[PDB]
């Protein structure tokens, strides 16, 4: 196998990241809310929202994907006990008005798939690997209750500066989680 | 979650997500460290990342404490960047001193191949179909695939050195293993 990379991407994304960061996430958010809620305001949704563009278009700045996605504040790492993990909180605008807040990022390994297709790895091949990556990761999560409860995959096919609104897509998911 | 053929993905992941991102700027970070510390701490002449590949996938989370003959010296200037929506994601690399016969004998930028931790964790998660024996062949295949990738990345190959080894305790010194590699490159 030279380009069957999806199983390795899914297992490393879970074992080397989600498994490690998700258990401490709620306590980091509770610390943030204690620090900020009386001034900046607090975060109600305690899940990590993971953007999964099947076309592997992964800008490093979410506002490049959609100008209605605005960086709010860093979610700092937990203090070292007596590799660091930081995350980024974003607000989502609708009608030039704040409509949602959450912890939000892309599934970074989709960038590996993107880079591979830029130099015998097709874009046909890339989409099949992206889909296999997603399905393998969802299979793993479905077997991991607490990890599954502390994050949400947001999967979509669009290339993100056309008519598709990534902010609207995230907001639909946020409003669905409150359900 | 039953296809554990992960080594090809681990290699391409490590290359694109780490080596291609960190190796181009590494020499400049070492030069910047030398500039800030040369007249006090002494210079680091070897500018390559030394990457430890224990084929048994044993990765201590503190290399310095793990070995009495390997001592942390100084972190490099941090590399911070927006990464896939995480603002200011940080990549840190560390200089270590290697001791021999009790005395300092080498200094270099050093770390473990972190994907080996994934393979180790896989072999302990209670799933059927992945034992220590499967983990070893995935580790070898990961190493083999990564070296195949770097054979066609000459700039990356000139900015790092892969230190691949089996491990038996006192019949193998990691510091000795690293020193032999350092001395080979000086050649
Ligand atoms: N501290 C962190 N912050 C944010 N996300 C994190 C993270 N650590 C892990 N992840 C996520 O998990 C994926 C796999 O991590 P893993 O460490 O297994 O596999 C990593 C690791 O072997 C190496 N690597 C990446 N960042 C590193 C670092 N700061 N130090 C050492 N090695 C790193 O490159 C591989 C692929 O990296 P990539 O980013 O593409 O893919 C990462 C990233 O999506």
Curated annotation (Swiss-Prot), chain A:
Signal peptide: none
Superkingdom of origin: Eukaryota
Main location: endoplasmic reticulum
Region of interest (Cyclic dinucleotide-binding domain (CBD)), ranges: 3-179
GO cellular component, one term: mitochondrial outer membrane
Residues reported to bind 3',3'-c-di-GMP: 12, 17, 83-86, 108
MF-aspect GO terms: 2',3'-cyclic GMP-AMP binding; cyclic-di-GMP binding; protein homodimerization activity; proton channel activity; signaling adaptor activity
GO-annotated biological processes: activation of innate immune response; autophagosome assembly; cGAS/STING signaling pathway; defense response to virus; innate immune response; positive regulation of interferon-beta production; positive regulation of macroautophagy; positive regulation of type I interferon production
Binding site for 2',3'-cGAMP: 12, 17, 83, 108
Keywords attached to this entry: Autophagy, Cell membrane, Cytoplasm, Cytoplasmic vesicle, Endoplasmic reticulum, Golgi apparatus, Host-virus interaction, Immunity, Innate immunity, Ion channel, Ion transport, Isopeptide bond, Lipoprotein, Membrane, Mitochondrion, Mitochondrion outer membrane, Nucleotide-binding, Palmitate, Phosphoprotein, Transmembrane, Transmembrane helix, Transport, Ubl conjugation
Modification note: Phosphorylation by TBK1 leads to activation and production of IFN-beta. The phosphorylated pLxIS motif constitutes an IRF3-binding motif, leading to recruitment of the transcription factor IRF3 to induce type-I interferons and other cytokines. Phosphorylated on tyrosine residues upon MHC-II aggregation. Dephosphorylation by PPP6C leads to inactivation and decreased production of IFN-beta. Ubiquitinated.
Cellular compartment(s): Endoplasmic reticulum membrane; Cytoplasm, Perinuclear region; Endoplasmic reticulum-Golgi intermediate compartment membrane; Golgi apparatus membrane
Tissue-wise expression: Expressed at higher level in the spleen, lymph node, lung and bone marrow, followed by the small intestine, heart, liver and brain, and to a lesser extent in the stomach and kidney.
Segments in the Cytoplasmic topological domain: 2-179
Residue positions binding 2',3'-cUAMP: 17, 83, 108
Summary of the function given for this chain in its UniProt record: Facilitator of innate immune signaling that acts as a sensor of cytosolic DNA from bacteria and viruses and promotes the production of type I interferon (IFN-alpha and IFN-beta). Innate immune response is triggered in response to non-CpG double-stranded DNA from viruses and bacteria delivered to the cytoplasm. Acts by binding cyclic dinucleotides: recognizes and binds cyclic di-GMP (c-di-GMP), a second messenger produced by bacteria, cyclic UMP-AMP (2',3'-cUAMP), and cyclic GMP-AMP (cGAMP), a messenger produced by CGAS in response to DNA virus in the cytosol.
Subunit and interaction comment: Homotetramer; in presence of cyclic nucleotide (c-di-GMP or cGAMP), forms tetramers and higher-order oligomers through side-by-side packing. Interacts (when phosphorylated) with IRF3; following activation and phosphorylation on the pLxIS motif by TBK1, recruits IRF3. Interacts with DDX58/RIG-I, MAVS and SSR2. Interacts with RNF5 and TRIM56. Interacts with TBK1; when homodimer, leading to subsequent production of IFN-beta.
Family: Belongs to the STING family.
Domains: entry comment: In absence of cGAMP, the transmembrane and cytoplasmic regions interact to form an integrated, domain-swapped dimeric assembly. In absence of cyclic nucleotide (c-di-GMP or cGAMP), the protein is autoinhibited by an intramolecular interaction between the cyclic dinucleotide-binding domain (CBD) and the C-terminal tail (CTT). Following cGAMP-binding, the cyclic dinucleotide-binding domain (CBD) is closed, leading to a 180 degrees rotation of the CBD domain relative to the transmembrane domain. The pLxIS motif constitutes an IRF3-binding motif: following phosphorylation by TBK1, the phosphorylated pLxIS motif of STING1 recruits IRF3. IRF3 is then phosphorylated and activated by TBK1 to induce type-I interferons and other cytokines.
Name the record gives this protein: Stimulator of interferon genes protein
Taxonomic classification: Eukaryota, Metazoa, Chordata, Craniata, Vertebrata
Encoding gene (name): STING1
Part of the intact protein present: 152 to 338 of 378
